[PDB]
Each structure stands twice: as C-alpha cells, then as structure tokens.
Ligand binder design. Sequence first.
Ligand code: BCL
Ligand code: BCL
Ligand code: BCL
Ligand code: BCL
Ligand code: BCL
Ligand SMILES: CC(C)=CCC/C(C)=C/C=C/C(C)=C/C=C/C(C)=C/C=C/C=C(C)/C=C/C=C(C)/C=C/C=C(\C)CCCC(C)(C)O
Ligand SMILES: CC(C)=CCC/C(C)=C/C=C/C(C)=C/C=C/C(C)=C/C=C/C=C(C)/C=C/C=C(C)/C=C/C=C(\C)CCCC(C)(C)O
Ligand SMILES: CC(C)=CCC/C(C)=C/C=C/C(C)=C/C=C/C(C)=C/C=C/C=C(C)/C=C/C=C(C)/C=C/C=C(\C)CCCC(C)(C)O
Ligand SMILES: CC(C)=CCC/C(C)=C/C=C/C(C)=C/C=C/C(C)=C/C=C/C=C(C)/C=C/C=C(C)/C=C/C=C(\C)CCCC(C)(C)O
Ligand SMILES: CC(C)=CCC/C(C)=C/C=C/C(C)=C/C=C/C(C)=C/C=C/C=C(C)/C=C/C=C(C)/C=C/C=C(\C)CCCC(C)(C)O
Ligand SMILES: CC(C)=CCC/C(C)=C/C=C/C(C)=C/C=C/C(C)=C/C=C/C=C(C)/C=C/C=C(C)/C=C/C=C(\C)CCCC(C)(C)O
Ligand SMILES: CC(C)=CCC/C(C)=C/C=C/C(C)=C/C=C/C(C)=C/C=C/C=C(C)/C=C/C=C(C)/C=C/C=C(\C)CCCC(C)(C)O
Lengths: 46, 46, 46, 46, 46, 46, 46, 46, 46, 94, 50, 50, 50, 50, 50, 50, 50, 50, 50
Amino acid sequence: ADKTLTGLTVEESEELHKHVIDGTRIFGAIAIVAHFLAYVYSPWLH
Amino acid sequence: ADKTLTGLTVEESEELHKHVIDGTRIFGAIAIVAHFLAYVYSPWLH
Amino acid sequence: ADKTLTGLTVEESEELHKHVIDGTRIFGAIAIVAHFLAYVYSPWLH
Amino acid sequence: ADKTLTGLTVEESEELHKHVIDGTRIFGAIAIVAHFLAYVYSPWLH
Amino acid sequence: ADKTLTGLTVEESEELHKHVIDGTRIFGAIAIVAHFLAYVYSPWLH
Amino acid sequence: ADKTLTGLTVEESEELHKHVIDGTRIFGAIAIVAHFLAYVYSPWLH
Amino acid sequence: ADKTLTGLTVEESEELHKHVIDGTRIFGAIAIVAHFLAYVYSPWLH
Amino acid sequence: ADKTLTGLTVEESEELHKHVIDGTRIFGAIAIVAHFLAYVYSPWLH
Amino acid sequence: ADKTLTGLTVEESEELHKHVIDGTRIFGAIAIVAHFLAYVYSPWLH
Amino acid sequence: EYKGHSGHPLILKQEGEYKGYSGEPLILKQEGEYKGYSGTPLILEQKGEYQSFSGTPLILKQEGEYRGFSGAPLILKQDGEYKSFSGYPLLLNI
Amino acid sequence: MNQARIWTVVKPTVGLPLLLGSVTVIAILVHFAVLSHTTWFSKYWNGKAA
Amino acid sequence: MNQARIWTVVKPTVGLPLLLGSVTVIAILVHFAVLSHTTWFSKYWNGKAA
Amino acid sequence: MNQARIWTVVKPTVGLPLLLGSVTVIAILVHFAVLSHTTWFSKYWNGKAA
Amino acid sequence: MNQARIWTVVKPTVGLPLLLGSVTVIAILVHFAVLSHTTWFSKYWNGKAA
Amino acid sequence: MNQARIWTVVKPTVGLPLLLGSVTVIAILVHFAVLSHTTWFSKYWNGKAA
Amino acid sequence: MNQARIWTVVKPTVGLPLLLGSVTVIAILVHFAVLSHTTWFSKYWNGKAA
Amino acid sequence: MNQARIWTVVKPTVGLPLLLGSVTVIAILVHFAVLSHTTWFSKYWNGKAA
Amino acid sequence: MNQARIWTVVKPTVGLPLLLGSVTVIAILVHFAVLSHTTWFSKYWNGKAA
Amino acid sequence: MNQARIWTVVKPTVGLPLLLGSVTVIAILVHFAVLSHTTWFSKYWNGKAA
Ligand code: BCL
Ligand code: BCL
Ligand code: BCL
Ligand code: BCL
Ligand code: BCL
Ligand SMILES: CC(C)=CCC/C(C)=C/C=C/C(C)=C/C=C/C(C)=C/C=C/C=C(C)/C=C/C=C(C)/C=C/C=C(\C)CCCC(C)(C)O
Ligand SMILES: CC(C)=CCC/C(C)=C/C=C/C(C)=C/C=C/C(C)=C/C=C/C=C(C)/C=C/C=C(C)/C=C/C=C(\C)CCCC(C)(C)O
Ligand SMILES: CC(C)=CCC/C(C)=C/C=C/C(C)=C/C=C/C(C)=C/C=C/C=C(C)/C=C/C=C(C)/C=C/C=C(\C)CCCC(C)(C)O
Ligand SMILES: CC(C)=CCC/C(C)=C/C=C/C(C)=C/C=C/C(C)=C/C=C/C=C(C)/C=C/C=C(C)/C=C/C=C(\C)CCCC(C)(C)O
Ligand SMILES: CC(C)=CCC/C(C)=C/C=C/C(C)=C/C=C/C(C)=C/C=C/C=C(C)/C=C/C=C(C)/C=C/C=C(\C)CCCC(C)(C)O
Ligand SMILES: CC(C)=CCC/C(C)=C/C=C/C(C)=C/C=C/C(C)=C/C=C/C=C(C)/C=C/C=C(C)/C=C/C=C(\C)CCCC(C)(C)O
Ligand SMILES: CC(C)=CCC/C(C)=C/C=C/C(C)=C/C=C/C(C)=C/C=C/C=C(C)/C=C/C=C(C)/C=C/C=C(\C)CCCC(C)(C)O
C-alpha cells in the first residue's frame, strides 16, 4: 500500500463508508415513516 | 492490531462508546418523563 | 512527475475530479426532474 | 497505565472531575435557592 | 529559480492563472447572456 | 512533581488564582456600590 | 540583507506593491467612470 | 528564574504594563473631558 | 539587544511605527477636511 | 477507473498548454519590471529615515525605560508574594 | 455506494462531524420553516390552548 | 451501538464536545420554538400576571 | 471537465467539504427565498389548513 | 459521577472553558427569554417607573 | 491578465476557494437584493398565483 | 478559592482572556437588557430631552 | 507609494485576500445602503413594474 | 498597577490587541446605545434638518 | 509616538491588519449610523428622486 492523504487505506475507507451508507438508509427509512405519519395526521396533501 | 487516526485502540473506542450509549439512554429516559409531564400539565395532545 | 502542494498526483487529481463531474451531472439530472415536477404542479411559468 | 490522549492520568482526570461534580452541586444548590426566591416573590406557580 | 512563498513556481502560477482568466471570461459570457435574457423578458430598461 | 498541561507549577497556578480571587472580590465590591447607587437613584425596589 | 518576518525580500515586496498601487489606480479609474455615469443618469447632485 | 509561558521576563512584562496603565489613564482623562463636554452641551443631568 | 517575541528588533519596530504614526496623521488630516466639507454642505452645527 | 453513471467522457484528456475555451492570450507575460497600465511612477523609495509628509518628529524615543505622561507611579511594588487589597484568606484549597 | 474512497482524501474527523452536523442543521431548518409558514404546526403545539 | 469504532477515526476531544453542545443547542432551540409559537408556555411563566 | 488538476493545488479535505457544503447552503437559500416570496409554496404546506 | 475519565480524552483547556461558558450562555438565554415573554420581570425592573 | 504571479505569494488552497466562494456569495446577494427590491421578480415566481 | 489549580489544566492565555471577556460581555448584555426593558434608563439619558 | 515594504512584515497570503475582500465588501455595503435609502435605485430595477 | 505580571502568562500578541479591540467595541456599543435610545443625539446630527 | 516598541510584542501580520481593518469597520459604522438617524444624508443620495 501507499499513504492516502487521510491515512485510511482504501479498505478502511470502504469500511467507514458502509456505516455512512447504512446510516443514510436508516435515516431515510425513519424519515419515510415520519412523512407517512405527517401525511396521515396533518392536512398536507389532503 | 494497528494504530488509529485518533490514537485510541478499538477496545478504548468501544469503551468510550458505552458511555455515549448509556448517556443517550439516560437522556432519552429523562426526555420521556419530561414529555409525560408536559402531556399531563400542558394542553398538548388533549 | 513531481510532488504537488496537496500531495495528490495528476492522475489522483483527475480520478478525484471524475467523481466531482459525475456528481455534478447527477445533481443536475435530479434538479432537472425537480424543475419539471415543479412546473407540472406549481403555477410557475403558467 | 499509558499516555492518554490529553496527557492526564486516570487519577488526575478523576481528581479534576471531583471539582466538576462539586461545582455542579454548588451551582444546583444555589439555583434551587434562586428558584425558591423566584417562586416566593414572583407570580409563577401561583 | 528559488523557493516561492507558496511553493508554486512562476511557470506553475501562470498556468493556474490561465484557468482563472478563462473561468472569469466564461463566467462573463454566461452573465452577459443572462443579462440579455433579463432585458428581453423583464421590465428592466423599459 | 511533573510538567502540567499548561506548564505552570502548582505554586504558579495558585499564585495566579490569587489575582483572580482578588480581582473577583474587587469587582464585587464595585458592583455592590453600583447597585446601592442604582437603588438610591432609580425607581427600582421602590 | 537579512530575513524578513514574511520571508519576502525588499525587492520582491516593492514589486508586489507595484501591483497593489496599479490595482488601486485601475479601481479608482473605473470607479470615477461609474460615478460619472451615476451622475449623468441618476437624480443625484441634480 | 525560568522561561515564562509567553517568553517575556517579569521585568519586560512590568515595563509593558506601564504602557497599559498609562494608556488607561490617558484614555480615562480624555473620556473625563468628553463627559464634561457632553454634560455642558447635552440635556443629560439637566 | 535580544530576539523579541515577534522577531522585529527595537530599530525595526520603531521604523514600522513611523509609518503607523504618519498613516494616522494623514488619516486625521483627510478626516478633518471631510468634516469641514460636511459642515459647509450639511445642516450639521447650523 | 471511475465508471460513473452519466456517460463519458467525464474529463478532457489533452496535454501541454492549457487550450482555454475563451480565445487567446489568456495572460500577459512579464519580461521584467512591472509597468503600470496606470502609467508611472508607482513607488516612492525609502533610502534612510522614513520621510514623513506630516512633519517631525514621528516618534518619541524611550531609553528602554518608560515613564508615563500620567507621571508616576505606574505600577506597585510586588515582592515575596502578591499583596491583596481584599483581605485574607485568599485561597482555601484542599 | 461508489464514493467510498472519499475518506482517503477527506479527513473522517472533519467530514463525519460536518455530515452529521449539516444533516441535523437541515432538519432543524425544515422544522423552523414549516413552523413559520403553516398555521397547523403551531396549532398542534397549542392544543386546547388552555 | 454498532458505531462504537467511530472514536477510532473521529477525535474524542472534537466529537464529544460537538455532540454534547449540539444536543444542548437543539434543546434550547426547541424551547424557544415552543415558547414563541404557543400561548400556554408564556402564560405558564406569567402565572397570575399580577 | 478541464479543471481536473484543481485538486493538485486545493486540498481535497478543504475544497470538497466547501463544495458540497456550499451547494447544500445554496439549495437551502433558494428554498427559503421562494418560500418567503410566494404564496403557493406556503399554501402547499398549509394544505387544508386543518 | 461515573464520567470522571472523560478528561483523559477531552482536553481540560477545551472542555472546561466550553462547559463553564455553555452554562453561562444558557443562563443568559433563560433570563432573556423570561424577560421577553413575561410582564412581571420587566415590571420588576421598572419598579415605580419614576 | 498580468497578475498571473499572484499564486506565487497567495496560496492556491486559500485564494481559489475565497475567489470562487466570494463570486458565488455576491451572486446570491444580488439575487436577494433584486428579489427584495422589485415586484416583477416575486411575481415571476408566483406566476398565476394559484 | 479551592479552584486555584484550574490553571494547571486550563491555559492562562486562554482562560484569562475568556474570563475577563465573558464578564465584560455579561455586563454589556445586562445594560442593554435593562435599557431595552425599562423607561427610566432611557429617560435618564434623555434628561431635559432638549 | 511609500508603503511598499508593508509586505515584508504583513504576509501577502493574508493582507492580499483581506484587501481584495474588504474592498469588495465595502462596495457591496455601499450598494445595499443606497438601494435601501433611495427610491430611484429600486425604481431603476423595477422599471415599468410589469 | 499590581497585575503587571499578567503578560508573563497572557501572550501580548493576543491580550493586548484583544484589550484595545474590546475597549473600542465597547465605545462603539455605548454610542449606538445612546443614539438609539435618545432623541437629542439624533437631533444633533440633523441640526437644522435642512 | 511613545508606543513604537508595540511591534516587538504584537505581530505586524496581526496588529496591522487589525488596525487598518478596525478603522475601516468604524468608518463604515459611522456612515451607517448617520445615514439611519438623519434625513439629509438620505435626501442627498435621493436628490430630485426622479
Ligand atoms: C438519467 C440519464 C443520465 C445520463 C445518461 C447518459 C447516457 C445513456 C449517455 C450519456 C452520454 C453523455 N452524457 Mg450523461 N446522463 C445524465 C446526465 C448528464 C448531464 C447533465 C444532467 O448535466 C450531462 C451534461 C451529461 C453529459 C453527457 C455527455 C458527456 C455524453 C453525450 C451527451 C448525450 O447525448 O447524453 C444523453 C442525452 C440525453 C438523454 C438528452 C438530454 C440531455 C440533458 C443535458 C440531460 C438530461 C438529464 C435527465 C433529465 C435525467 C433524468 C432522465 C429520466 C431518467 C428519464 N450527462 C443522467 C444522469 N449520458 C453518452 C455517453 O457518454 O455514451 C457513452 C450516452 O450515450
Ligand atoms: C462563447 C464564446 C467564448 C469566446 C470565444 C472567442 C473567440 C471565438 C475569439 C476569442 C478571442 C478573444 N477573446 Mg474570448 N470568448 C469568450 C469570452 C471572452 C471574454 C469575456 C466574455 O469577458 C473576453 C474578454 C475574452 C477575451 C478575448 C480576447 C483575448 C480575444 C479578442 C476578443 C474577441 O474576439 O472576442 C470575441 C467575443 C465577442 C466579440 C463577444 C462574445 C459574445 C458572447 C458572450 C459569446 C458569443 C456568443 C455565444 C453563442 C453565446 C453563448 C455563451 C455560452 C453560454 C457559454 N473572451 C467566450 C467564453 N474568444 C479571439 C481570439 O483569440 O482569436 C484568435 C476570437 O476570435
Ligand atoms: C500638509 C498637511 C500635513 C502635515 C504637514 C506638516 C508640515 C509641513 C509640518 C508639520 C509639522 C508637525 N506636524 Mg504634521 N502634517 C499633517 C498632519 C499632522 C497631524 C494631524 C492631522 O493630526 C499632526 C498631529 C501632526 C503633527 C505634527 C508635529 C509633529 C509637527 C509640529 C506641529 C506644527 O508645527 O504644526 C504646524 C501646522 C500643521 C502641521 C497643520 C495642522 C492642521 C491640519 C493638518 C489641517 C487639515 C488638513 C489641511 C487642510 C491640509 C490638506 C490635507 C490633504 C487633504 C491630505 N501632523 C498633514 C498630513 N506637519 C511641522 C514640523 O515638523 O515642525 C518642526 C511642519 O513644519
Ligand atoms: C474595603 C473593601 C474591600 C475588602 C477589604 C477587606 C479587609 C480590610 C478585610 C477583609 C477580610 C476578608 N475579606 Mg475582603 N474586601 C472586599 C471584598 C470582599 C468580598 C466581596 C464579595 O466583595 C469578599 C467575599 C471578601 C472576603 C473576605 C474574607 C475572606 C475576610 C473576612 C472573613 C470574615 O470574618 O467574614 C465575614 C465578613 C465578611 C465576608 C465581609 C468581608 C468584607 C465585605 C464583603 C466588603 C464590602 C466592600 C464594599 C461593598 C465596598 C468597598 C468600596 C470600594 C468599592 C473599594 N472580601 C473589598 C475589595 N476584606 C478581613 C479579614 O478577615 O482579613 C484577615 C479584613 O480584615
Ligand atoms: C436597577 C439596577 C438593576 C441591575 C443592574 C445591573 C447592571 C447594569 C449590571 C449588574 C451586574 C450584576 N448584577 Mg445587578 N441589577 C439589578 C438587580 C440584580 C439582581 C436581582 C435578582 O434583582 C441580581 C441577582 C443582581 C446581580 C448581579 C450580578 C450577577 C452582577 C455583578 C457580578 C459580580 O459582582 O461579579 C463578581 C463576583 C462576585 C461578587 C462573586 C464572588 C464573591 C462571592 C461572595 C463568593 C462566593 C462565590 C460562589 C461560592 C461561587 C459559585 C460557584 C458556582 C459553581 C458558579 N442584580 C437591578 C434590577 N446589575 C453587573 C454585571 O453584569 O456584571 C457582570 C452589571 O454590569
Ligand atoms: C456603507 C456606507 C453608506 C458608506 C461607507 C463609506 C466608506 C467608509 C467607504 C470606504 C471605501 C474605501 C476605504 C475604499 C477603498 C478602496 C481601495 C483601497 C481599493 C484598492 C484596490 C486594490 C487593488 C485592486 C489591488 C490589487 C492587487 C493585486 C492584483 C496584486 C497582485 C499581486 C501579485 C500579482 C503578486 C506579485 C508577486 C511578485 C512581486 C513576486 O511578482
Ligand atoms: C437566493 C436566490 C433567490 C437566488 C440564488 C441563485 C443562485 C446564485 C444559484 C446558484 C447555484 C449554483 C451555483 C449551483 C451549483 C451547483 C453545483 C456546482 C453542484 C455540484 C455538485 C457536485 C457534487 C454532487 C459533487 C460530488 C463529489 C463527490 C461525491 C466526490 C467524491 C470524491 C471521492 C470519492 C474521492 C476519490 C479519491 C480517489 C479514489 C480518486 O483517490
Ligand atoms: C428550508 C427548506 C424550506 C427547504 C430545504 C430543502 C433541502 C435543501 C433539504 C435537503 C436535505 C438533505 C440534503 C438531506 C440529506 C440527508 C442525508 C444525506 C442524510 C445522511 C445521514 C447519514 C448518517 C446518519 C451517517 C451516519 C454515519 C455513521 C454513524 C458513521 C460511522 C462511522 C464509524 C463507526 C467509523 C468506522 C471506523 C472503521 C470501521 C473504518 O474502523
Ligand atoms: C449589492 C448590490 C445590490 C449590487 C452590487 C454588487 C457587486 C458590487 C457586484 C460585484 C461583482 C464582482 C466583483 C464580480 C466578479 C466576478 C469575477 C471576478 C468572477 C471570476 C470567476 C472566476 C472563475 C470561475 C475561476 C475559476 C478558476 C478555476 C476553475 C481554476 C482552476 C485551476 C486549475 C485547474 C489549475 C491548477 C493546476 C496546475 C496549473 C497547478 O497544474
Ligand atoms: C458609533 C458612533 C455613531 C460613533 C462612535 C464611533 C467611534 C467610537 C469611533 C472611533 C474612532 C477611532 C478610535 C478612530 C481611530 C482612527 C485611527 C487610529 C486611524 C489610524 C490610521 C492608521 C493608518 C492609516 C496606518 C497606516 C499604516 C501603514 C501604511 C503602515 C505601513 C507599514 C510598513 C510599510 C512596514 C514597514 C516595515 C519596515 C519598518 C521594516 O520597513
Ligand atoms: C441579560 C440578563 C437580563 C440577565 C443575565 C443575568 C446573569 C446570568 C448574570 C450573570 C453574571 C455573572 C455570571 C457574573 C460573574 C462575574 C464574575 C465571576 C466576575 C469575575 C471577575 C474576575 C476578575 C476581575 C479577574 C481578574 C483577574 C486578574 C486581574 C488576573 C491577573 C493575573 C496575573 C497578574 C498573572 C499572574 C501570574 C504570576 C503569578 C505567575 O505572576
Ligand atoms: C451598553 C451600555 C448602555 C452600557 C455598557 C456599560 C459598560 C459595560 C461599560 C464598560 C466599560 C469598560 C469595561 C471600559 C474599559 C476601559 C479600559 C479598560 C480602557 C483601557 C485602555 C487601555 C489602553 C489605551 C492601553 C494601551 C496600551 C498600549 C499603548 C500598549 C503598548 C505596549 C507596548 C509599547 C509593547 C512594548 C513594551 C516593551 C516594554 C516590551 O517594549
């Protein structure tokens, strides 16, 4: 290997990004539920 | 084992996160009580 | 080649910019669809 | 024991935190007196 | 040659400025067209 | 003894604090007089 | 000669300032024209 | 004697503070005159 | 003579301050003129 | 290679002089001393004591030993220990 | 899912705090927007308006 | 609970102050929001309003 | 597509966060602008005005 | 009381000034909030209003 | 076109972000200025005002 | 008086300016608060109101 | 024209960006000032007010 | 006159500029305060109000 | 004229930018103050109001 600017290897950067992708998916799924609840109970889109 | 960017070992990072998780649970528990008190005394959700 | 101010080689800088260009094109593609939907549903340009 | 990220040993960190805990207790105690005085002289909770 | 304050040689600084001048000229051309459209459609200069 | 995080010895840190305590007491004394004059001349507490 | 706080020699400093003086004079000239145009077309000084 | 945290000796610091003290006395005397003038001409304290 | 905190010797600092003093005196002279012009043309002090 | 999703090329591939899009020249070289487009001269030399325009003196010299225009004393003596003005005890550490 | 090597060039101790902070600031701003520009969100908090 | 290794890439002296500070700022913002967009919260502090 | 070498002189850990951050800030500002100077955008959120 | 080791990972010259400063800022914000959203606090300072 | 040597004394990682950022900030400020000081710009966004 | 050792962990060049500065900011804020929420303070500065 | 040695004590990468930025800020401020405190500047942009 | 040793622990290039700057900021604030909460200060600048 | 040695303890690349910047900021503030608290300054820019 050779030094990246940050010092994370390509593999360590990919393992870090798995958490970032999974975090975005979890945030999205919760936000989808929050939008469904906001639709169900607010006058939005009614 | 290998050196990390922050200097903490994986074992030290997991120990630190236990305090973060415990603190988040304590904060959540107190927040739940505060919402219950607010619901009882304020006109919200009535 | 020679060392640069940021430490990235010319090849590394070019491979990085490919993500920036592709990201800009993806952002533009989504933004175009957003403008089309905005037009189809909002009173803008009507 | 080994060098910490901040340089303080476990004993020094614990001795430092004692002042933080005592300080929070002193602040809390004075705040309770201030709330009592406020309750007595202000129309709050009346 | 001698070490510059930024580390870029005079030759490298000139090639960088070529992109800055080109960028300014491109930005100016797009801006000119945008101003022409504003004149044609907005009540400005009417 | 060992080098503190700030480089000040215990004796130096305590001798510094003596100015902070004295300075706080002097500030308090002036502030008390300022409040007395405010009471005597303003409509506060009347 | 001797080292300077900025690492820029006296000759390089005087040559740098030439661009600053010329830039100020060019800014002043354009500004003078802008004020003349503003006077001719706006109600200012009328 | 030992190297201070700032590098100034006790003597150099005391000579520096003389300018701070004198500067404060100069500022204070000027401000006193400004208050006398503001009193004589403004409706304050009248 | 010894290395100062900033690196400027006593002679270099005194020479720099001459430009600061002359710069202030020039700013003052220009400001005095601007005040006279403002007085002659504005209703201030009239 | 970065495959992308938005078609190809993603970057331009030529080498040498930057063939900028907005005609040429892109810059003006200098063979030597900068000449102002606002003409000349640009600089006034310093060759000794700084020439004021605002008369002289420009500074008041101090002999490594200041004495103020508010006279004296400017500081209090301080030896053996700090002297408090607000009485004692002054610390109560453990 | 193709950007994974960004952490070879953006410091994680910078990009992750800025990512989580920015997402949170956006969420706060969207709440304050809907709160300022609807009647019903304020009304939901006011409830019976005791 | 699975993000425990974040402290190997994000400095604790940075993430922990930012986390505790952000939670505090969010709490303050929610209080000010409800305080401005409701009547009962202001009424609670005003009490008898004598 | 010809500026690809900009990353040899501008640090990626600086330019990329500033780029992604600015693009996000611009989008936020454009939303607030349209929200503050139009009626239909607020009307869309208010819906039935329940 | 179980967080005593936080000072081994958070610099005291950072966490302590931020802690003391945050507490003071919160106190100031609470005073300004009550002062703005209540009548009696302002009336207390006015007193006789002479 | 004669200032090309500026990058020998001003760091590209500083001057380039400040240049591109300032130009963008100015464009935003101009749009907000025209939007808040004219009637036709807001009317253009409202369109039919439905 | 028992906190005398805080300067062993908090840098004097940081804590001393931040202390004196914060104290001054509080004093400024208290003067502005009383000035904004009272009549007699403004009345004192107007005096004869000439 | 006699201050040419300022760059020997003030770093060019500091003073030059601050100079150009400050001049641009001053210009922006003067435009906003005249735009707010005059009628004709707004009228010029509004034109026929179509 | 007894604090003279503060410069042995507080960096002059930090505290001394911050002192002069703070004193100036305070003076500016006091002018703006009296200008906003009085009539005679504004009246003095208007003079004859020509 | 007796403070000439200030530059031995205050860095010129800090004190000189702060001095020139502060004096400029002060001038901007004084212009905005007189502009906001007078009629004739606005009238001068408005002229005939044509
Ligand atoms: C969803 C569709 C994909 C897409 C898929 C393709 C395909 C497929 C091809 C290219 C190819 C090209 N792409 Mg691409 N590309 C997109 C976005 C862009 C954008 C942009 C939005 O700014 C740009 C400037 C480019 C640039 C380019 C050129 C380098 C090249 C030749 C132009 C062409 O005919 O394209 C295709 C042109 C059009 C489809 C006409 C409209 C073009 C405009 C400028 C953008 C339309 C975006 C659209 C609204 C996104 C949503 C579409 C819906 C999914 C239906 N792409 C999006 C992300 N691109 C070519 C290539 O490199 O082949 C090897 C090619 O054949
Ligand atoms: C889009 C066209 C290109 C362009 C293409 C050319 C061409 C072609 C030539 C030059 C050449 C020159 N260019 Mg160029 N150049 C542009 C932008 C600029 C700008 C600027 C906008 O401020 C400047 C100052 C310059 C500077 C110069 C001089 C060094 C030189 C002589 C002037 C000239 O011929 O102008 C030409 C420009 C005009 C007379 C007016 C341009 C009007 C508009 C803005 C552009 C043309 C219409 C276009 C279809 C509109 C769409 C723009 C897109 C939205 C980007 N370029 C843009 C980005 N440039 C010459 C050269 O080097 O020859 C060897 C030359 O013949
Ligand atoms: C031409 C205007 C020049 C100027 C040119 C001179 C000259 C010439 C001399 C001095 C000398 C002196 N100057 Mg000088 N000086 C100016 C500004 C100043 C200011 C200030 C504005 O606060 C101060 C405090 C000083 C300080 C001093 C003393 C160190 C010294 C002795 C006083 C004396 O004899 O005064 C005499 C009277 C004055 C200096 C005039 C004071 C009135 C001010 C300047 C009026 C406003 C501006 C005026 C209308 C001119 C137009 C300015 C342009 C628009 C920029 N100068 C400006 C920058 N100065 C003298 C010296 O060294 O003696 C040994 C001397 O011979
Ligand atoms: C003259 C005003 C001086 C002062 C001069 C002295 C003197 C003289 C003595 C002390 C001593 C003491 N001072 Mg002291 N001190 C002042 C301000 C303070 C303040 C404060 C919040 O203002 C505090 C908490 C203290 C603390 C203390 C105690 C450690 C101690 C008394 C113990 C005791 O029996 O306690 C119970 C009694 C008290 C806590 C009362 C302490 C004094 C009060 C608070 C002073 C009020 C000042 C008044 C408002 C304004 C003065 C005018 C100008 C503003 C300067 N000082 C001011 C700056 N102090 C005494 C000691 O024990 O020394 C061995 C002693 O002899
Ligand atoms: C009409 C006049 C106005 C008014 C106008 C002003 C103005 C204007 C100002 C003040 C200022 C102050 N006012 Mg007042 N003030 C009013 C009425 C009040 C009321 C009230 C409930 O009515 C209170 C509580 C106060 C109290 C105070 C202080 C908070 C503050 C001076 C600080 C000081 O002395 O620091 C020095 C510190 C001390 C004296 C404490 C040390 C000595 C003590 C005795 C020792 C024990 C310390 C203790 C154990 C430590 C606690 C540890 C905790 C863990 C933190 N005023 C009235 C309504 N007041 C000033 C200010 O803001 O200063 C910052 C200010 O400028
Ligand atoms: C708001 C209201 C109502 C009222 C406010 C009123 C008010 C107070 C207004 C105040 C206004 C003021 C103060 C305006 C001041 C304006 C000024 C001063 C403008 C200056 C412009 C300077 C320029 C353009 C400099 C360009 C420099 C350049 C290009 C430098 C290039 C350097 C190079 C190439 C390096 C060479 C390296 C090597 C030597 C090795 O070759
Ligand atoms: C306010 C009003 C009314 C009006 C204001 C109007 C106004 C002015 C509007 C202006 C709008 C503007 C200007 C909009 C501009 C938008 C732009 C430019 C969008 C750009 C998007 C870019 C993206 C998405 C980049 C992604 C990069 C990525 C993901 C990079 C990934 C990098 C990696 C993986 C490292 C690889 C390392 C290796 C492996 C090579 O070593
Ligand atoms: C205002 C108005 C009206 C309108 C405005 C409208 C508008 C513009 C809205 C815009 C909204 C936007 C843009 C929203 C975007 C949202 C996004 C993108 C959310 C992303 C969430 C990401 C998460 C949750 C990441 C968690 C990462 C995690 C936990 C990472 C963990 C890492 C670890 C453990 C280290 C590993 C160490 C090792 C293994 C290597 O050793
Ligand atoms: C306020 C109101 C109402 C009204 C008044 C408002 C007001 C006053 C407005 C004033 C507006 C002004 C002043 C506008 C000025 C605009 C300007 C100047 C725009 C300039 C654009 C420049 C660009 C786009 C540069 C791109 C550079 C780039 C991409 C550089 C890339 C470099 C590379 C790849 C080389 C590195 C690799 C190696 C060579 C080493 O190999
Ligand atoms: C708020 C309301 C309504 C009202 C109240 C507002 C209020 C309170 C206002 C207060 C205002 C105040 C306080 C104003 C103060 C103004 C002053 C002090 C101005 C000073 C100007 C100084 C200048 C121009 C200096 C130029 C220096 C220069 C050019 C230096 C050059 C140096 C060089 C060449 C290096 C040489 C290196 C080597 C020696 C080695 O050769
Ligand atoms: C806004 C509304 C409506 C309501 C808000 C209400 C509200 C919340 C108010 C809160 C107010 C608060 C909290 C006020 C607190 C005030 C305090 C704590 C004041 C402290 C003053 C301290 C001083 C003066 C220290 C001087 C130190 C000094 C001079 C140190 C000198 C050091 C030296 C010489 C170095 C020696 C080195 C060597 C020994 C080696 O030689
Ligand atoms: C908002 C409302 C309504 C109300 C608000 C009310 C309110 C809170 C008001 C508060 C006001 C306050 C707090 C005011 C405080 C004012 C003070 C403290 C002024 C101090 C002035 C200090 C000066 C002038 C220092 C000059 C230093 C100098 C010249 C130093 C020179 C140094 C040298 C030569 C170094 C080389 C030397 C070597 C020996 C080494 O060679």
